[PDB]
Amino acid sequence: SNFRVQPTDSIVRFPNITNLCPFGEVFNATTFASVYAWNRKRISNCVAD
Amino acid sequence: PTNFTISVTTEILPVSMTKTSVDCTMYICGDSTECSNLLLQYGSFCTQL
């Protein structure tokens, strides 16, 4: 069997996204929506921190 | 009978088949370290094969 090779390094490759996510315009957002007419919004081009 | 005949016939027989070998860890885990460390608290189902 194989006991002779152990992986050594670990590499990461992510695309070049810089602007952070709008957590603060969907999180304080003076007025929210009623539950029976809830609000749906798409999120794109984010570094989700 | 008053005359005869010489007849040549054919018979075909298998004698052997192919020889194989299986690596247990490479088939199950496949160069993973999280696996093949969980496949050590299982039993001896890889020497007996």
Ligand SMILES: *[C@@H]1O[C@H](CO)[C@@H](O[C@@H]2O[C@H](CO)[C@@H](O[C@@H]3O[C@H](CO)[C@@H](O)[C@H](O)[C@@H]3O)[C@H](O)[C@H]2NC(C)=O)[C@H](O)[C@H]1NC(C)=O
């Ligand atoms: C026992 O059987 C054999 C056949 O297994 C007989 O032999 C055959 O004899 C005949 C007559 O002699 C041969 O016919 C000849 O054919 C040639 C052309 O191929 C022709 O030029 C001749 O004029 C004649 O017609 C036949 O070919 C021959 N077969 C073999 C394989 O030799 C044999 O005569 C029989 N014997 C008894 C005791 O009946």
Ligand SMILES: *[C@@H]1O[C@H](CO)[C@@H](O)[C@H](O)[C@H]1NC(C)=O
């Ligand atoms: C709501 O979030 C926005 C985005 O950062 C910020 O500018 C604003 O001051 C916040 N309002 C309150 C009351 O925190």
